[PDB]
Design a protein around this ligand. Sequence first.
Ligand SMILES: *[C@@H]1O[C@H](CO)[C@@H](O[C@@H]2O[C@H](CO)[C@@H](O)[C@H](O)[C@H]2NC(C)=O)[C@H](O)[C@H]1NC(C)=O
Ligand SMILES: *[C@@H]1O[C@H](CO)[C@@H](O[C@@H]2O[C@H](CO)[C@@H](O)[C@H](O)[C@H]2NC(C)=O)[C@H](O)[C@H]1NC(C)=O
Ligand SMILES: *[C@@H]1O[C@H](CO)[C@@H](O)[C@H](O)[C@H]1NC(C)=O
Ligand SMILES: *[C@@H]1O[C@H](CO)[C@@H](O)[C@H](O)[C@H]1NC(C)=O
Ligand SMILES: *[C@@H]1O[C@H](CO)[C@@H](O)[C@H](O)[C@H]1NC(C)=O
Ligand SMILES: *[C@@H]1O[C@H](CO)[C@@H](O)[C@H](O)[C@H]1NC(C)=O
Ligand SMILES: *[C@@H]1O[C@H](CO)[C@@H](O)[C@H](O)[C@H]1NC(C)=O
Ligand SMILES: [Cu+2]
Ligand SMILES: [Cu+2]
Ligand SMILES: [Cu+2]
Ligand SMILES: [Cu+2]
Length: 547
Amino acid sequence: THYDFVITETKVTRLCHEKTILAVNGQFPGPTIYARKDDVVIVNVYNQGYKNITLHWHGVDQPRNPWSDGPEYITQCPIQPGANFTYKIIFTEEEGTLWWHAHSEFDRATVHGAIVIHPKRGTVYPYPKPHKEMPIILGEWWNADVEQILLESQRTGGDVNISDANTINGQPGDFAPCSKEDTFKMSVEHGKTYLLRVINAGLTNEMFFAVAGHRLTVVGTDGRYLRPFTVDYILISPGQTMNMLLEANCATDGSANSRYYMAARPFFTNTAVNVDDKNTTAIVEYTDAPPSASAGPPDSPDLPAMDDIAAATAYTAQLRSLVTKEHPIDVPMEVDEHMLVTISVNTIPCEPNKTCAGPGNNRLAASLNNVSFMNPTIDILDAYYDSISGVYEPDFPNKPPFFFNFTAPNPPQDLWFTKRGTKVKVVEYGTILEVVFQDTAILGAESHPMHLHGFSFYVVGRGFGNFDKDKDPATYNLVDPPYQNTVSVPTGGWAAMRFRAANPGVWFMHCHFDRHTVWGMDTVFIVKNGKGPDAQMMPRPPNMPKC
Ligand SMILES: *[C@@H]1O[C@H](CO)[C@@H](O[C@@H]2O[C@H](CO)[C@@H](O)[C@H](O)[C@H]2NC(C)=O)[C@H](O)[C@H]1NC(C)=O
Ligand SMILES: *[C@@H]1O[C@H](CO)[C@@H](O[C@@H]2O[C@H](CO)[C@@H](O)[C@H](O)[C@H]2NC(C)=O)[C@H](O)[C@H]1NC(C)=O
Ligand SMILES: *[C@@H]1O[C@H](CO)[C@@H](O)[C@H](O)[C@H]1NC(C)=O
Ligand SMILES: *[C@@H]1O[C@H](CO)[C@@H](O)[C@H](O)[C@H]1NC(C)=O
Ligand SMILES: *[C@@H]1O[C@H](CO)[C@@H](O)[C@H](O)[C@H]1NC(C)=O
Ligand SMILES: *[C@@H]1O[C@H](CO)[C@@H](O)[C@H](O)[C@H]1NC(C)=O
Ligand SMILES: *[C@@H]1O[C@H](CO)[C@@H](O)[C@H](O)[C@H]1NC(C)=O
Ligand SMILES: [Cu+2]
Ligand SMILES: [Cu+2]
Ligand SMILES: [Cu+2]
Ligand SMILES: [Cu+2]
């Protein structure tokens, strides 16, 4: 239950381009944290790298413990080069696959890895014990320094350069330059079943994913078992994890291929905008088949076309919590407070005496309810703990300030603009929230993976167009809605979720596309202390990084 994570400057080559990246213990992707349900894990983080950094345990509630949650300038100031900080990871309701990642700037492009939470002793999976288990991390690779990619977009006000490759476990795969020799490979044995622990650790795109010749039985997401369902492909958004069983059925007598491509490729609908649309591949190999069975290329799966919105919708519609006696659910039935939260990409005016590269030569930005979040220089959590004025404003609104036909295409240029602020939403302990995310069509309808730190939530509804508060709740799933920490809000649509705000602390909510995070598609929930010691935020640890 104890790890040392040393942030290292590590030389890595992909696509024949060598660079020095930030990595953890010289590993890219970083090491896997293994735990069992309800463990407490300690991670000592030693920043031996060249820049300010933080780490986050994605999807871990961290009850009463925002001090170890990680988001830069939200719960802590950064771990400075040469400093260290000890994180306490408190696992509770989570069982399945989560992941950890840097939560500063774009550092998670290389600083990330898996979290595996096994059933605690005396319990078992709700499915037959897999023969083997394999994390499958989807990610991106840039040849340039990721920090320079970020800094250039900050200077120009234009869009972030697209990655040069999509990756599986750090490796672009068979169809990229200088990549075929080190394509990720896993061995399978006929008749055995494998648990694929799929994590989308990329920065930019929802991804379709599939394995040639093999159906996938999905059994969990975001640390919560799902009602099982079998598919030919999945959709997975940055922030999300998806667990699925693969059954190695294909013949090993030489009558069938012994090698099968695992493959992923973006789901992306904006034809006007650049995307790293390259697929990434890995190989499933049946090891006890004859050499002739691997004479040709591995078989390829059919992936939905990149703009196949129906295929995305059809996967997401199948997600439902597993509800049994061993795995109960608690859907909040009576809502104390409703929020409508419009999600937009935006512009702000270019700075004086400068030309910017964003739409209309303005500077790109993003907003929730038309507030574009800007990080403070004193982290929110210290400001809340010490009652420091002038850091944040506690009036993030429950509804957009101007109602319009949110999803109508090509809104007029005057609706592009937004305004910066550091606004948070303060709620009493135990408040039951229904949060409805409403995508707008400003600068292009787009699916956004909205993520809430400190909580999972029940996704009770979704649809296309504008949420109708007097009609859409009538068909909510109040029985087995999926329990997620990151929800794909539909392209040009809405998603409704509910949760009890019963975790006292300071909790980031943001789109899990990093460019939208930095542009300001974020806010913060401060959940005040309740009554009793179990409803009190933990005290500040003695060695928090200084601001
Ligand atoms: C989001 O906020 C921006 C900035 O506050 C709004 O743009 C302003 O709109 C008023 C008119 O209502 C103008 O007088 C200002 O000049 C605008 N500021 C600009 C363009 O920088 C924008 O209308 C809001 N959008 C919404 C609520 O959808
Ligand atoms: C690395 O993080 C530290 C801590 O946030 C930054 O140092 C602070 O910078 C602010 C200005 O925004 C000053 O008001 C504080 O006095 C600084 N605190 C220190 C030095 O302990 C530092 O700027 C960050 N480095 C970079 C490159 O952003
Ligand atoms: C880690 O940081 C603390 C200060 O917060 C320092 O006293 C300690 O010596 C550092 N090094 C370790 C723990 O190896
Ligand atoms: C971003 O891409 C453009 C090509 O469209 C290139 O000119 C520029 O150098 C790239 N930026 C960085 C930081 O590599
Ligand atoms: C990946 O893309 C390459 C280049 O377009 C293509 O030749 C290959 O068939 C693709 N692989 C899969 C599995 O889709
Ligand atoms: C800066 O901008 C102002 C206002 O647009 C302009 O009058 C001034 O000439 C600019 N400064 C230069 C070009 O050095
Ligand atoms: C909103 O926009 C949609 C899409 O263009 C359109 O079909 C619908 O009629 C609009 N609704 C109203 C009330 O104008
Ligand atoms: Cu995350
Ligand atoms: Cu998180
Ligand atoms: Cu987004
Ligand atoms: Cu986050």
